Structure formats: C-alpha cells, structure tokens
Amino acid sequence: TNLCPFGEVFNATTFASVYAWNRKRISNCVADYSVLYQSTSFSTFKCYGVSPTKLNDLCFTNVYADSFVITGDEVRQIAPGQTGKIADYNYKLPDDFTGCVIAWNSKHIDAKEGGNFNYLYRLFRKANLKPFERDISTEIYQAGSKPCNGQTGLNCYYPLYRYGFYPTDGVGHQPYRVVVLSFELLNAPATVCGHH
Amino acid sequence: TNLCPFGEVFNATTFASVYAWNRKRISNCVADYSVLYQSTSFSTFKCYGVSPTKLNDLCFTNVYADSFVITGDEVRQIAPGQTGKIADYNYKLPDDFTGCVIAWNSKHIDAKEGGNFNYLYRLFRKANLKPFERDISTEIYQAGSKPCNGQTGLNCYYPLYRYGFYPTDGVGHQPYRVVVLSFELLNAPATVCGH
Amino acid sequence: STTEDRAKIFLDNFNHEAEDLSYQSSLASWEYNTNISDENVQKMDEAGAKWSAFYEEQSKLAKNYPLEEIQTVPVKLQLQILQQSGSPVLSEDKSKRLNSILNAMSTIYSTGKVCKPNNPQECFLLEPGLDNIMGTSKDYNERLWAWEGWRAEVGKQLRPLYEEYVALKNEMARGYHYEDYGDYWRRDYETEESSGSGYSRDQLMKDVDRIFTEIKPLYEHLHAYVRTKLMDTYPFHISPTGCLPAHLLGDMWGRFWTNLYPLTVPFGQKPNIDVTDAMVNQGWDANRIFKEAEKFFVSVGLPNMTEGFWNNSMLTEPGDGRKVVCHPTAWDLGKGDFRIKMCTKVTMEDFLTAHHEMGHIQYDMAYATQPYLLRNGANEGFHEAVGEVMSLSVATPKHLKTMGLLSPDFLEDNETEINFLLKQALNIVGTLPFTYMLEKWRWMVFRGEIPKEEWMKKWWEMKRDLVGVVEPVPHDETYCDPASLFHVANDYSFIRYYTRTIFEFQFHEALCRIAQHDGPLHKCDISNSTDAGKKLHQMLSVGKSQPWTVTLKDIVDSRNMDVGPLLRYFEPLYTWLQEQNRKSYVGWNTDWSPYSD
Amino acid sequence: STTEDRAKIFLDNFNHEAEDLSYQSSLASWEYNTNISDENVQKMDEAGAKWSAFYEEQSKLAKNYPLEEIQTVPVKLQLQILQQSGSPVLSEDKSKRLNSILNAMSTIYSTGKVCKPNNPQECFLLEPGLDNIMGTSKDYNERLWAWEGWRAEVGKQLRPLYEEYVALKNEMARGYHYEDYGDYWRRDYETEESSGSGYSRDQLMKDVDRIFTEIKPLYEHLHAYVRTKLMDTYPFHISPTGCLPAHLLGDMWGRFWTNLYPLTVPFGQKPNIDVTDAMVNQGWDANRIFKEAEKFFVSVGLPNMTEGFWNNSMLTEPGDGRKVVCHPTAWDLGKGDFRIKMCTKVTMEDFLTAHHEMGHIQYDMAYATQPYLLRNGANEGFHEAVGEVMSLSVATPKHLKTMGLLSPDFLEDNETEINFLLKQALNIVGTLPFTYMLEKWRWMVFRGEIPKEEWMKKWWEMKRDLVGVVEPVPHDETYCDPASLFHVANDYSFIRYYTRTIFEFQFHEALCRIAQHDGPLHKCDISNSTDAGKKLHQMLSVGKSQPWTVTLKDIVDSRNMDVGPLLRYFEPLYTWLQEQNRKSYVGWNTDWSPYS
Ligand SMILES: *[C@@H]1O[C@H](CO)[C@@H](O)[C@H](O)[C@H]1NC(C)=O
C-alpha cells in the first residue's frame, strides 16, 4: 500500500505548455487529499461533480493529473462549458466533468527578468478541441483560400504563440500553474483511494 | 329800466392788454344772464360763489366786467388764490371773489400770419399785486444792487413784453379773451337785477 | 440780492425774448422742408441769423453770473449752456466756406443720381429708385451696379468737400475748447458732478467699446446664419468663412439687415409677421397708421396728439408738385407746436417708424414744462430710444393679432417666436456693429488717427474687421463711402443710433416689469398698462434738467448703459442660432474678398 | 472565407504580437527615463525600432482587407487605425531627410543658448535661465532681450528646417489621401456613422471656431483687466487700447498668464491657499500624497492602485543615486503594468499633480481590456481632461478643510473666491486664444493658405487679431517664431489643449450635477459621489472603441462640445470683471505696436 505520486505532479520544477499539456495517470495507490484541500497555497480550488471534503471517502478506478501553465486571467477558462483561446483550442473540459481544478500564482518560478518565453499556447485552430484532446501540430494556419505552403503572411499564421512572463506583469497576465484532477468515475475495479 | 349792456363788453371789437386790463361798471340795470349761459362758444365759464342759473333770481348793487387777452395756458390763473405771472403781476382776483370768469379762444381775431404783437403783459414787479389793482407804469425793473436810473442794461429790464400770436401756435399759447364779472354786495340798494 | 436771484431773472428774460426768435426760426426752417425753393432758403438764413445774433449777446451776458455762487442745479445748468457757447469762433470767411461745403454735400446727396450703363438717358435718384433696388433686388450684378454707382457718382464728389469739412469742423471744435469735432459731439452725454464722479466724454468711448465686445457672440451667430442663407440666393458669390459682401445686405449700406428677412426667414411656412401685405389689403392709409400709433400711446396713459399736430403736419408726400425732405423728423417748434414730417408709405416699416417719431413728439410734450434751455432728452440716445421702446411692444405678434393684421386664429408657438426674433435681430442686432464702426471711423478721423491717404483703406479694414462686411469692388482714396450715407454727409452724429438700442431694452425691461409681465422679455406688450405709462412719463418730464444717469437710475434702477436686457431679449433666438450653426462656420476671415479669391 | 472573417484573424495575430513588442519597448524606455545611461538609450532605441518595423509591416498588410466588406465596428475601427498610418509613402531617401530634420529641430531646441548682449561669456538655456527670466522678471528690457534672443538664435535656425518639414509632412499626409498634414492631424476627432451623421474632420474646425468666438466676452474682459494691472508695473510701454506686448505675459510665449497673478491679484491682503507649510508640519512624504489621491478615487467608487503600481512606480526623485527625468508622467506600459514617474516634493503643486496623474492611470485601467489599438482616450482631449477634472474637486477649500490641510477657521468670503477664480482664469482662459491661434496658423500653413513669404507676417497679424497680443520688435521672414515653442518644433499637434479644456468643464459640470452639488460650480467636490464614479467609469472603460460623440453624450448628455460649462464655471469672475472694467477700455486696436 504505497501513496499516489501527486508530489511529482504538484511539486514539479517546470510544467508543460498548455498547448501540449502534460498528463499523469494515477492508479493503484492511496493518497490523502486533505493535504490539497487544506493546503492554503492555492489561489483556485474548484471541484465539479464531487465534494472535496469527501473525496477522502471515495475510490476511483483512475485519476488523471493534468498540469500546464496559463495567465491568471485565463484560469477562469479551466471550467466546463467555457469559451476562449485556451478552452477552444488548448485544454477543454467536458460538460459532465468530475474532478477538481487547482491553480496558484507561479510568478516566482516562471517569470524572469527580460521575460520567460518557454511556455507556448495555440492561437488558431480549424475547429474547437473535443474534451481532453491534445493537439501539438505546428501547422501553418490557412485562413484564406490560397494554400499556404509555409512561412507566414498572406493570411497564413504560425499557430503557436509564446507567453512572455515578466515580474512586472499585471496579476491578470502573471503565470499560473494549473493541476486538473479528473476522477474516471465510470466502472471497473477502483484502485486509487483516499485515506484520512 | 332797460337791460344791461353786456354785448359791448363781450362782443367788443378790441380787448385790452392784461397789464392794462379794462373795467366796465354795470349799474342801474336788469340783465338776462341766460344768453351768457346758453352761448356754447366759451371754453371756460367758471362761477365762484354763485351759480350761472341762480344769477337770474339774484339782485346785485353793482357788477364789474373786466376784460383783457391772455394765453390759454394762463386762463387757469384767473381764479382765487392763484399765482403766476398773470396773477402775481397783471390781474389778481381776491380770495373772497364772488362772480364768474368767462374766456374763449380768440385765435381767429387776435392771431395773424407772421405773429400779432399788439398784446403786452408784465413780466417783473417789485411785489405781487393786490386784488383788482392795476399797474400801467413803464418803470425799469431794478433787479440789482446797482440803480439803473436811466434805462435798460445788465440786471435791469423793461417790465412789459409782447405776446406773439400765430395761427400755428399751440392751444395753450393761443390768444384767449377773458371777461370777469364781479358781483359786489353793497350796503346800499341793489340796482343790477336778473329776470 | 443773491447772485442766483439775479441769474433767475436774467434767464427769465432770456426765455421770454428767446421764444419768438426760436419759433420764427423753426417756422421758417419748416416751411423750407415742406416746400423747398431758393426763396425759402433765404428765409431760413435770415431767421437763423437773428437766432444766432441774439444767442451770442445772451451767451456773453450769462458770464456775469459766475457759476460758483449758484446753489440750484437747473439754474446752474441753464447758465452752463448759455455761458459755454458764443459764436465768435471761426473767421467769417471760414464760416461762409463751411456752410457752403455743408450745403454742397447735402444737395449732392439729395440730388445725386446714377444712370444705367445701357441707357445713360435713364438714371435713378437715391431717395426713390436706388432705395427700391437695394431694398428688394435679388440679382447680384444689379445690386453691384447700384452700390458702386452711388459710391462713384456721389461719393467721389463728396470726397474733397468732406476733407475740407473735417479740417473746418475740427477748428471750430478746438475753438470751443474740445479735443476735436468728435469730442464736441460726445459732449451730449457728459454730466457735471455729484461727488466728482460724472459721465466724462472719454467714458462714452469706453462703454461703447465694452458693449461692442459683449455683443460679439450674438452678432457673430446672426452673421453666420445670414451668411449660409445668402449662399442660396447668390450661389457662387459668398464664402462660407469670408466676410459678407456690402452690396447684398438689404439697403444701400447694410445699415439694417431687415429686408434680408425673405431670404433668411427660419420657418416661412408659418404666416407672416411682416404685416405689410395685410396692411395694404385692409385699406390702411397714412391717417390710419398715425391714428393707430396715437391710440397705442393713449392706452398707457399718455396724451393724445395735439390738435395742431393733426392740423399742420406733413404725413404724406404732397401731390401739388412741392419738393420736400422725405427724411422722417419729429419737430418741437415751440409754443406747444409739435409736428411730424415724413412721406408715409403703407408698409410695416413706416408703421413702426410712426410709433418711433410719435415717441419723439411724446417726449417733447412732457418736458415742455421745463425751462427753454432744458427742453431736451436726457441725452440723444434717450430721445432716440423712447419711440423704439414703444415699437417693441407694438411689434409683438400678440399685439399685432389684436388689431387686425394677423388672422385671429393664428396660433403662436416656438416657430413663430423664432420668426419674430429673427426679424427683430435683422433690424436691431445687425445695426450695432455697423453704427459702431461708422462712428468709430469718424471719431478716429476727427482725432487725426487716420490720415487722408488711408481713409478708404482704413474704412474698409474696419468694415472687414468689426462688421464682417467686405467691399465687392476695391476703392481707392477718390471714393468717400462714409459720406454716401445721409447722416455723414448731412453732418449728424451717429452714435445716437447705438446707445439708443441699448437704452431701449433697459427701458422695455423696466416697463414690462412695472406692467407685471409674467414671462419672457420678448412676449411683453405694455399696451393698456398706465403704470408703465406713468413711470415713462415721469422720466420724460425731466428733460435734460437732470443728469441722464440720475434719471436713468430712476427708471431701471441703474446708472449705467447695459446690454443685459438686449441679450436676454434675444436669448431664445441666440440658443436657436447656436443649434442652426452647428454645421456652419461662425466668424469671418478678413482676407477674403469677391475681387480676389 | 468572408473578408471580415480573415480580418478578425489578422487582428488577432496583430494584437498578440503587438502586445509583447509594445511591452518590450515600454519596458526599455521606462528603464532609460528612470536611469539615464548610454546603455539604456541603446535598449530603448532598439525596442522602439523593432516595434516600428512591426507596426509598418502590419500596417501595410492591413491595407489588404477592404473596409467596405467589414461590418463589425471594432474590427473596422482597428483596421482603419492600422490602414491610415505606418505604411510608407515617402522614398527611403526622403524618409531619411525628414527624420534628420525632425531630430535636428528637436536638438536645436533642446540645446539653444542665448547670450547676454554686452557680456557674451554668460549665456542661458530655456530649461532654467530663460524660463526663469520670463516667469519672474519685471524688467521690460530684460524680458525683451530674453524673448527676442530666444527667437533670433533658435527660431531663425529652425526656419529653413521648418519649411522643408512642412513639405515632407504634407507629402506623407497626402500619400494617405488626407488633404494636408493639418487634415491628417484632425482625423483624431473623425467618427464613422449612425447614418452619415459622423463627426467630420472639417467639423472640428467649425467647432473650434464657434467656441473661439463664444469665449470672446470673457477673454476680452480678462485681457482688459490684465492690461490695466500691467500698466501699474510697465508705465511707459502699455497702451490703454493696444495689444499686450508678447514678452510681458509671464513666460517665453504667453501660453499661460499664470505667473502674472502677483501683478494682477484682485485682493492682495487675503491669503492665498497654500497648504505646503501645513503638509510639511504633518510630516507628510510622497507616499502619503499618493495614498490620499488613491483614497480620493476609491471614495468615488473607483479601484485602488495595483500592487505593481506601488512597487514599480518612481514616486520620489530616485534616492539621488541615478540620473532621472523628473517631468511627471503616467505610464500604461501594457499587460496590467501601470506606473507613475514623478519627483514628488511635499508641495501643494505636487499634491495636485498626483491626482492629475492617478486620473490618467485610472483611465488606463478602465479600458485595459479593450484591443490594443483602442486603449486610448475617446479622442486626444479626453485623457488630459479627466486629469484636470480630478484636480478641480481635490483643490477646493472644503476638500482641504475636511482633510486637515487647511484650517476650518479659513474664511471663504467673496474676495477669496475671486482671487482663486482669477488665478484659474489666467491659466485656463489665457491659453485658449493662444492655442486656437497657434493651431490655426499651422492648419493654414499646411493647407497652403499662408505662403512662405508671409509666414511671420500672418503669425503676428493673427497674434494681434485673435490673441490681442503684439510683438515688441518686428520680425521678418528669416524668423520662425511658431517654431520657438516646444510642441511646434517637436512635431506635436497642439489643439488638444484647447479641446481638453472645453471637455474638462463639460465633464465637471455634469459630474457635480450628478453629485447633487448645491452651489457654485467652482466650489464642487465629487468626493463620495459613487454615482459620479459610475458615470465616469462608464466613460473611461469604452476607450476609443466607440465614436467619442456617443461616449461624450453618455456622460454629459450632450453630443457636441460646449463652452457653456466653462463660461458658467467662470461667471462670477465675469460679472466681477465687468464692474472692474467700467472705467477701462475692453478689446484692442491691432494697429498700435511698441515700436510704432
Ligand atoms: C354777441 O353777438 C352774437 C351774434 O350777434 C350773439 O349770439 C351773442 O348773444 C352776443 N352776445 C351778447 C352778450 O350780446
């Protein structure tokens, strides 16, 4: 009986870019979620389809921890039935979502003098993402009838853009680290359980 | 006992200047004052102490008719307790005046093209006149400390000036013929009676 | 005894001896204006000569009574007007030359005529035909021909005459102990004292100058409005930022913008507050116009016109071939003799005029009880203002409705309001910068501030700058356009027509408030008021026996000229104009002209 | 697919690249201003040049999306702003000549030195010396030397440059299908529609004219008053009926008459309200000033400053360890990065300035979420207006009394208020005809109505006719006196300062109405009028994403500019001035000159 590897998720030195969001599948363990709920180091902690005080009483067949970075103003899009650049083309949550969305301000790690442009996002896509879908294509977006063979201009744009995170950014633009815990509450043997 | 000679006073062809106003004495007569009252040609007919219609019942010892010419604006001064150039220095009526004052517009007769300057009045006098007093002196008026002995000059003026009557004069400045009848109440028998 | 006693007797004598002399001078001058001929000129000259001689001798004799020991103000005033006179000022040669120059200028103005270029057999005088053209014509070239023809045929003649006239008048003025002829003109408002604080002659310049700026916004908005509407009838001749062409303003000079009203009426679908046509249709004649004016004055408690007024006035141009002066004048001949002289056409202009002139007469009648010397308006402006004050209430559509003229249903609202205040504004506002600029140009010429060599140049600069009116043709110094207006070539001051305007509205506002008028200044009609009439007559009775400031204070509870009332009177029109000009330019560029774009 | 669909994508990309670049530039530039070094000026000019090349490129590409095809108003507006600028119109060679002219006029102005006539060794700069002389001198001949000196040593150097500048600038403007460079500068007030009811670029000229003439009574009465008071101190040189000589007006051009207050104060025995002493007594530092200002904005229901505002702004002269630009500014760098750079001293002037500047920032914040191109005041007059309005409420005697800076024993009789209104009138009413006149000269010069051979001739004619101000010495066409002013020679439009003023009072009167202020408009204080706050935030948040006619109507219930509120603010000073000028002339004679 050993504990879930949530430490690797939450305490990771760097997170992935939202467009290519990182997911860890959590199985066959026991974890204490009271640590997460009582953390008091999270700016955002909102749960859907489940109660946080009570997921210490619950057992789940699978748990998915997704982690990525977005701006503060964008955290609101990590919720069911939302629209925006992130929700439409980067990370989409289903309407019948069961899980929690946790976020905290990441300015001290992910902002640097002169700007941190390590983190990318997707700005254009031909249709919205389906829930839990990941698109890492680096295909020139073709907004005109004229075919784009590459490069840019003439109504053809490179789909990925880089965030620039500075210490002098306004709070809405500062980096935020998001972990989305999904509980795959459907069926099979449940092996991911909470102790007390 | 025949009727008073009022026509010669009223219908006279020439009237006097106010400064030397004319008086006719009416005695030993009987008069019909109804002609005067029924004239309808008089601008002014004001009676003091008597009524024109009561004069037909009344008997008086003597009647005095004073006649002269003045401007329309000046007619208001022909009344008891009035002051002005006419009343102060030319013709003054006593406070106890009992009689009638009659006047009428005289422009057709006494105004002429180019002005009629027959008529004179007194402009200055050393003191106001007494009632029914007449001053016809032509003495230079001494308005200054310096005597003027001889004649005209600064601060001495010749007292009498002439009216000038033009047909275009304004009504207040047009000539008016005035007759003043005074009825005196003598101690003796009445000789001037009405119908 | 007392020096003042003796002065009162002196002036007593002076009044009685002066009466027939002045009377005979008025009488002969009148005969000359109703029947002009050389003979009647001789009569005017000898009559005036006896007036002058007598006046001299009296004026000198008045200096024996020194002002320091006179206690009473009306006595001191009479002695002032006598003492500060005399006639031995200019050499006889120079007087004869001045009078001949005056005469020449006058008869040039009244006989000058311009012929058509394509019929030099067919000319026009100013007093009928050219007036008619400039007041009704809507063709540019026609108005140009008449405007230029007048200034070229008659002005150019008046130039050398006028140049000499200035020098001589200025000499006479300096002789009287005045700065210049203009100063001497401005003496009319001067007041002696009280605490040492009286109206001084420079002050009139200051107040006139202050009111001019205070009137700038209202004038300029009126001007922008008139400019845009004129663009419609003279399409390619008006600049939307340029000045207004002088020959397009509704009369020979643009003295009054009244006749622009058919070209500028805001809401022409509504009836007509120019009651000319209605007057004609109803059978009005001269006698009707004047009987009606009389009725109005009676209604506020003032007297009827005197019997002699009706008997011997000239209210129409005669048909017996006598030639006359059609210029309207109100006469106080003396001895209770009051008369009016005008050639009355059945138009609303002359209707209003008849109230204005009857207002002059009514002022004369009321100060008739004052001493001879004191029988005069409190100042020229006052005398000019009274009649107009009356014509304000008369002009009101409400007042018009009551005497025929506007159909009884009518219905007033804000459009008819705007129509009426636009008409008034043409007449009253349009004339203020004009009158101001004309008299200022004269004043400065008199002060030597403008030399001969720049006279027309400067004149047109001021027309451009102050009036916003530009000459259509360039005029060099052979012209004399100031002199082509009657008042300048006939030697009358002209500031009376400006102050009057101001005073008029102060009067109107005082009287309307005494009438207990509930509402806007411009709806007020003081007819039937009586308290209004009594207050006004209390003013008129004073004559000049008292400083025009003090008697002004007795009416409007102020001692100062004030356009506050004029401004409130027009404020409805002003905010309306403000909206109408939102897509016009307001104000003007003195560099644009119609001979150089 | 649809041309509007492709336009939205182009603007998406543009806004996203523009945000990063803009911020980089703003960041480099801010470092320079708060740390003057050659290294930092390198960074600022590099940032500015990547940002410039990006904006040129984007602007060219914008021209590929036809405006007719666009229906949405923000898309179309963005496209318009991107299309009418940035793209090249002049040749490479002529681009470079125009830039070298612009930089030559700036440096000729910034470095101008004028030497004492009989002592050539001692010379002066505009920045300290000349500014000081023109502000403080009562020596007629000293002021004349400074004024003429500055115009002859700097102006005459600018004249050839200014001429070629007008030609190249006109050539670019017309390249953009504007009729001249003045018409270009007027596009700021242009608005599209409703039904062709849009504000047109000529309508600005019409409005500025209508206002100019509606202000004539107040200005000419003020001018009158100032003329007679100047006579007391310049006996031989002031004609009772002439224009005011240009060099006696309180600064190097007569742009404000503020410094004439000691010469023209109505009542000199009443004390002026200066709480500088009172602030020092209470140990106040700059931080307290800005916290009070923030309190003022929160008190009307506006937000407090951001934490970044307090860590990042330069509120005091920086500890005297670095060279810094002390001219007060409010910086909207981007990305929620709001800053104030100001060398706050514990003075009343600095106290007020703080509110002005936090007003600018408050405006910045309200519209922070609009697209990049629309993060601006409704037009150029709006931003500065908002600042001015704030300073109004805050500076009233009641505000200082409730704050503790002014004794309650202070007495607000009619005299004190007149002194205040006259100081206001010097500053505010003075600058209007000056500003009108200057921009009118430049509009006319651009359009070709004033040819070279008459540039100065008309300049002075306009100074005499519109401003009632006369030059002390005649100037021929070797001079370029317009250009001896900072804004002229640095290619800044100037009429904003006119519209700003007009708007400020339109704002103020409305907001005080809403704050149920009972009394005189000049004694208004919108503090704790959250209602006013709400209407103000309404206006601020829209940016220039809407026709300014619409936003202006939302605040003041009027669609067009009005001097009504300004006239009405100053009306007590007006009626006072009228009684004062009762024995003086009002208006001027344009012919009189000191030298003639
Ligand atoms: C005067 O004569 C007229 C006409 O003859 C006459 O009517 C009138 O009565 C006369 N008066 C007197 C008093 O006889």
Side-chain angles (χ1 to χ4, degrees), chain A residues 73 85 107 114 117 121 123-124 141 143-145 153-155 157 161-164 166-171 173, chain D residues 1 6 8-13 16-17 19-20 23-24 27 61 65 306-307 312 334-337 339 369:
Chain A
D73 277 347
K85 289 293 157 153
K107 188 221 306 149
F117 302 82
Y121 58 88
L123 183 58
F124 306 113
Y141 178 69
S145 60
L154 179 127
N155 275 347
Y157 314 81
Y161 284 72
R162 321 187 85 98
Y163 285 117
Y166 295 88
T168 38
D169 273 325
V171 196
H173 294 267
Chain D
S1 211
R6 300 182 254 113
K8 298 198 187 205
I9 297 163
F10 170 70
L11 291 165
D12 226 8
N13 174 245
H16 278 91
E17 278 171 0
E19 221 80 26
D20 299 349
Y23 193 59
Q24 223 182 54
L27 224 42
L61 294 195
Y65 304 95
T306 79
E307 180 198 312
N312 300 151
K335 302 201 164 131
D337 193 352
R339 288 185 221 181
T369 46

Side-chain angles (χ1 to χ4, degrees), chain D residues 543-576:
Chain D
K544 74 174 309 148
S545 75
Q546 250 180 15
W548 66 265
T549 51
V550 170
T551 87
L552 181 76
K553 155 113 193 169
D554 289 350
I555 272 182
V556 301
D557 210 37
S558 307
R559 204 220 163 74
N560 210 347
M561 328 190 191
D562 223 301
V563 280
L566 183 144
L567 293 186
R568 277 173 242 135
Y569 175 105
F570 282 104
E571 196 207 312
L573 179 55
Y574 190 61
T575 39
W576 183 83

Side-chain angles (χ1 to χ4, degrees), chain B residues 6-7 10-11 35-36:
Chain B
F6 282 137
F10 279 79
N11 274 335
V35 53
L36 269 42

Side-chain angles (χ1 to χ4, degrees), chain D residues 486-497:
Chain D
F486 169 78
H487 308 62
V488 175
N490 279 268
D491 186 63
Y492 289 112
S493 95
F494 197 62
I495 198 55
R496 70 229 305 170
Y497 304 106

